[PDB]
Amino acid sequence: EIGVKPPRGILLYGPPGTGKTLIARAVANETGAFFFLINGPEIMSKLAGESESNLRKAFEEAEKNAPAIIFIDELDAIAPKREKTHGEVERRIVSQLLTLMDGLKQRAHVIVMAA
Amino acid sequence: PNRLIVDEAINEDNSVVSLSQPKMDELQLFRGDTVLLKGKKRREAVCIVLSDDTCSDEKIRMNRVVRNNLRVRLGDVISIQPCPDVKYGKRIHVLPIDDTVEGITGNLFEVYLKPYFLEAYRPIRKGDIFLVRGGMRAVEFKVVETDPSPYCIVAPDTVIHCEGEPIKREDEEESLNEVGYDDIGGCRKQLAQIKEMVELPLRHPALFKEIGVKPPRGILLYGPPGTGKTLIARAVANETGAFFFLINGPEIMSKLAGESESNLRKAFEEAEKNAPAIIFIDELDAIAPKREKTHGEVERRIVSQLLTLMDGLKQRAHVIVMAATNRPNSIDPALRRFGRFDREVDIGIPDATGRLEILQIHTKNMKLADDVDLEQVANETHGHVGADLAALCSEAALQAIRKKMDLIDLEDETIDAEVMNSLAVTMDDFRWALSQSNPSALRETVVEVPQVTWEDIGGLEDVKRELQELVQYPVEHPDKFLKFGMTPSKGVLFYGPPGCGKTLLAKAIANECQANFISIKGPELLTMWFGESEANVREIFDKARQAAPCVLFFDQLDSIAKARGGNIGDGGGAADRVINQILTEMDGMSTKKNVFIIGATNRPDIIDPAILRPGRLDQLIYIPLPDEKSRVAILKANLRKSPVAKDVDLEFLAKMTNGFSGADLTEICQRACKLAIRESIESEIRRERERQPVPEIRRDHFEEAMRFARRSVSDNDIRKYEMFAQTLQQSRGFGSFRFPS
Numbered sequence: 001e002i003g004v005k006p007p008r009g010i011l012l013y014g015p016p017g018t019g020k021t022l023i024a025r026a027v028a029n030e031t032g033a034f035f036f037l038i039n040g041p042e043i044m045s046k047l048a049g050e051s052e053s054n055l056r057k058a059f060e061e062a063e064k065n066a067p068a069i070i071f072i073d074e075l076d077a078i079a080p081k082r083e084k085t086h087g088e089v090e091r092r093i094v095s096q097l098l099t100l101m102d103g104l105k106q107r108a109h110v111i112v113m114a115a
Numbered sequence: 116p117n118r119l120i121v122d123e124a125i126n127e128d129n130s131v132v133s134l135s136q137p138k139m140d141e142l143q144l145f146r147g148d149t150v151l152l153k154g155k156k157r158r159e160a161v162c163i164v165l166s167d168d169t170c171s172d173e174k175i176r177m178n179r180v181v182r183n184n185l186r187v188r189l190g191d192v193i194s195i196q197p198c199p200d201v202k203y204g205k206r207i208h209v210l211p212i213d214d215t216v217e218g219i220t221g222n223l224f225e226v227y228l229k230p231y232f233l234e235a236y237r238p239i240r241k242g243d244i245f246l247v248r249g250g251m252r253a254v255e256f257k258v259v260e261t262d263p264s265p266y267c268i269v270a271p272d273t274v275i276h277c278e279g280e281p282i283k284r285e286d287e288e289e290s291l292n293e294v295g296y297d298d299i300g301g302c303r304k305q306l307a308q309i310k311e312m313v314e315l316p317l318r319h320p321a322l323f324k325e326i327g328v329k330p331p332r333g334i335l336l337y338g339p340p341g342t343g344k345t346l347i348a349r350a351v352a353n354e355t356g357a358f359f360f361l362i363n364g365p366e367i368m369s370k371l372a373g374e375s376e377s378n379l380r381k382a383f384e385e386a387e388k389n390a391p392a393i394i395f396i397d398e399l400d401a402i403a404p405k406r407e408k409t410h411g412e413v414e415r416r417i418v419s420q421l422l423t424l425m426d427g428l429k430q431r432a433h434v435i436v437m438a439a440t441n442r443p444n445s446i447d448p449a450l451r452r453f454g455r456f457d458r459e460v461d462i463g464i465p466d467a468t469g470r471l472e473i474l475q476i477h478t479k480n481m482k483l484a485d486d487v488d489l490e491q492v493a494n495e496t497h498g499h500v501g502a503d504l505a506a507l508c509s510e511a512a513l514q515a516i517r518k519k520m521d522l523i524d525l526e527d528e529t530i531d532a533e534v535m536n537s538l539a540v541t542m543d544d545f546r547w548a549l550s551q552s553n554p555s556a557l558r559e560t561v562v563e564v565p566q567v568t569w570e571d572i573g574g575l576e577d578v579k580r581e582l583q584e585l586v587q588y589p590v591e592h593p594d595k596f597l598k599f600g601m602t603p604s605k606g607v608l609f610y611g612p613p614g615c616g617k618t619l620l621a622k623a624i625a626n627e628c629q630a631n632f633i634s635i636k637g638p639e640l641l642t643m644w645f646g647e648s649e650a651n652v653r654e655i656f657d658k659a660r661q662a663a664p665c666v667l668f669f670d671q672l673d674s675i676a677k678a679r680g681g682n683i684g685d686g687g688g689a690a691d692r693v694i695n696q697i698l699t700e701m702d703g704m705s706t707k708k709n710v711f712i713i714g715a716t717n718r719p720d721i722i723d724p725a726i727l728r729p730g731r732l733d734q735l736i737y738i739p740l741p742d743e744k745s746r747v748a749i750l751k752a753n754l755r756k757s758p759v760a761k762d763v764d765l766e767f768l769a770k771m772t773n774g775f776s777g778a779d780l781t782e783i784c785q786r787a788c789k790l791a792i793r794e795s796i797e798s799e800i801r802r803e804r805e806r807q808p809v810p811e812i813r814r815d816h817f818e819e820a821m822r823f824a825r826r827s828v829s830d831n832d833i834r835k836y837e838m839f840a841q842t843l844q845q846s847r848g849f850g851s852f853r854f855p856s
């Protein structure tokens with residue numbers, strides 16, 4: 001009705017153990033729209049190149065099964081500060097995540113949540 | 116004459132234009148001919164030209180479909196030219212829009228294309244979108260192949276096939292939402308320069324060949340973050356139809372030896388492969404610092420690679436390399452050479468009209484009420500940058516949303532249409548968003564607003580007028596000073612006994628006046644380091660110079676400014692060296708920007724006279740102890756909000772309070788009200804005690820109040836301030852200036 005931009009990026013931050021994963025599971029159990037969860041350790045465990053494919057496939061499936069709830073638990077694993085980082089694979093994953101974040105055209109009805 | 120104002124059609128379908136017959140004679144265009152139209156972002160249209168008796172000479176009548184094709188709206192300007200040599204079509208490929216054929220399972224060809232193309236000889240182009248009625252819902256099509264290309268006349272023999280993959284709504288929405296020259300506000304002159312460097316050689320290279328010069332291939336953009344450098348780059352790249360390649364400084368940088376060089380080489384290889392291209396290197400400052408300044412060899416290696424790449428790039432390629440930086444002085448001077456971004460284009464903080472344009476751009480899609488006024492928001496956002504303005508609009512939308520949550524039920528999926536239509540952006544929403552938004556030009560100098568207004572300040576009417584005039588006359592009336600050919604005054608110093616309103620007169624300007632306010636505590640700028648204390652002075656003035664018109668306020672200026680050379684204990688001359696840095700900033704060899712310097716000092720005699728000369732702090736205003744009339748105004752101003760008993764005679768208090776300062780009167784008001792708090796608290800407690808009053812402060816509260824009050828400034832102290840103001844009078848040409856005869 002008002003033609004505005006919904007906030008696609010939601011960032012939950014705080015001391016650990018507070019229940020961000022608890023909120024993640026609560027959202028997953030109780031959202032009618034499609035849900036798919038990705039973890040920082042899970043992405044980093046995968047070899048070079050396949051993590052690229054995993055992230056792209058996850059986002060593609062999310063926008064395919066619209067609406068979608070994209071959750072990245074332990075985001076700092078996959079997006080360490082570019083000012084202080086060494087791994088080029090991590091740099092490329094940061095660039096890929098940035099591009100995919102900018103990719104949404106808002107007709108995908110896909111929300112991205114970070115803990 | 117070719118340029119035409121876009122006008123509404125009356126009976127015209129997708130392939131006819133209705134124009135004035137006199138212009139048909141002027142342009143030598145005959146009825147029934149096929150005509151070529153070009154619009155914004157490189158869109159071409161072929162139409163059968165017709166004449167109309169009701170069309171204005173400068174206007175062209177067209178329907179919605181072609182305007183949507185031509186990406187032009189009513190009031191825009193389009194080009195009209197003959198389109199000869201258009202042959203009949205052999206085989207044309209059409210493809211429908213995905214959202215127009217949802218649920219349609221009929222034969223697209225027979226139902227839609229045949230009635231539309233039956234014996235009509237409609238001209239078409241590759242990429243055209245035309246709307247055809249019929250069936251159960253009007254169907255749009257996208258023309259993807261034309262034989263011949265890109266123009267053909269659809270003859271009856273033209274084999275028309277519509278099979279294939281329907282076009283997604285993604286490309287259609289991108290075409291409308293692709294950035295362009297319209298999405299830029301507040302940078303018209305810089306945009307014109309960039310047009311001259313980029314668009315003109317592409318449009319008319321014949322002029323450059325005639326004069327035999329090669330236009331520069333590099334444009335350097337510098338300004339505060341978010342001012343629109345990347346947006347300008349993308350807009351100029353999209354309008355020229357050049358492949359926009361974006362490079363960020365951090366992601367090029369790598370720990371491995373030579374990897375950043377390889378990244379730059381590969382990027383330039385991709386740009387030279389995909390031509391025309393416009394390389395954009397954001398954060399150029401971090402990637403390419405000064406080779407002699409840096410000690411890490413990788414930075415100098417990156418700079419040398421960039422030099423060799425941009426030098427070998429100029430092989431008559433169609434690639435233009437532009438970069439954005441916050442501070443151009445950090446960039447290596449080897450880059451500033453001929454070529455290698457040989458021209459620098461400056462993007463600044465948006466002005467009032469510029470930010471008004473930016474708000475109009477960012478609210479064109481948004482629904483707005485009739486109560487909301489855009490010029491108001493343009494005024495109130497004093498130092499906001501365009502990105503901040505877009506965030507402001509979004510935050511106001513979410514403001515309306517959080518207002519209207521309580522009406523809508525999140526549980527049910529059903530939506531009410533009237534509740535939906537009620538939703539619109541209101542002025543209150545912009546006010547909230549502005550209250551919870553920051554100016555990025557001043558985000559570093561952030562401070563709370565104590566909310567002081569000119570009506571709050573009691574007395575000082577002559578001094579109040581001068582502050583209004585000095586801050587307002589240049590910015591509000593710039594042509595008037597040009598008419599008289601003299602620059603305005605930009606310096607004020609307040610000296611007086613403590614508590615008389617020196618800080619109030621500055622806290623009023625921070626709110627009322629529409630000028631940026633950067634606030635400085637006295638010893639704030641000083642640093643224990645050798646070269647930082649003077650550097651802090653430089654950066655604070657640079658911040659104020661950037662966000663002009665700005666009011667720079669030096670509270671307790673006596674600490675910063677001393678008569679110089681007083682003693683060797685001043686940090687080994689560091690204190691006296693800070694003076695010299697301030698002296699050049701106020702009055703040095705730089706163009707006088709709209710930076711108004713105000714200083715509030717208690718003791719002015721210690722101030723360096725080089726500060727107090729005209730041109731730095733030219734107007735010295737003495738704020739005395741309030742007089743009988745002034746003390747009345749202070750009392751009324753303080754008790755304006757508080758409920759006061761009618762039997763209180765505020766004029767009587769001012770008569771007995773002979774020498775009390777301004778803060779002394781405010782203490783009495785606070786003390787008088789403080790006792791009234793004590794009385795109401797006890798009476799309320801007594802009511803609780805008995806079970807198991809004073810709506811306005813009475814005159815009885817005042818009588819016990821004054822006996823606690825006292826005079827902050829002694830008689831001897833006033834004499835010192837009184838002595839100083841007398842010297843200024845003695846310095847002037849004696850006697851009231853009387854012109855002879």
Ligand SMILES: Nc1ncnc2c1ncn2[C@@H]1O[C@H](COP(=O)(O)OP(=O)(O)OP(=O)(O)O)[C@@H](O)[C@H]1O
Pocket residue numbers: 571572573574575612613614615616617618619620715716717741748749752753777778781
């Ligand atoms: N003319 C006045 N009208 C109204 N209130 C005043 C006036 N003068 C002083 N006050 C009151 O004095 C208090 C603070 O005074 P203020 O900060 O303006 O003093 P100042 O002259 O700048 O002193 P200092 O030299 O100590 O910094 C406030 O409560 C303010 O309302």
Ligand SMILES: Nc1ncnc2c1ncn2[C@@H]1O[C@H](COP(=O)(O)OP(=O)(O)O)[C@@H](O)[C@H]1O
Pocket residue numbers: 015016017018019020021022074
């Ligand atoms: N209010 C709560 N109710 C139930 N469980 C909680 C609550 N707060 C925390 N937890 C528990 O703490 C864990 C949350 O850890 P979390 O902070 O998500 O780890 P990390 O932040 O390191 O990923 C969950 O397993 C959850 O069971």
Ligand SMILES: Nc1ncnc2c1ncn2[C@@H]1O[C@H](COP(=O)(O)OP(=O)(O)O)[C@@H](O)[C@H]1O
Pocket residue numbers: 298299300301302339340341342343344345346397439473476500501502505
């Ligand atoms: N002159 C302008 N007109 C319209 N929008 C602008 C303008 N300047 C900046 N913006 C907004 O700022 C955002 C982009 O910020 P940008 O200027 O690209 O960052 P930076 O210059 O720091 O790289 C865009 O959303 C754009 O709408």
Ligand SMILES: [Mg+2]
Pocket residue numbers: 617618670715
């Ligand atoms: Mg003060």
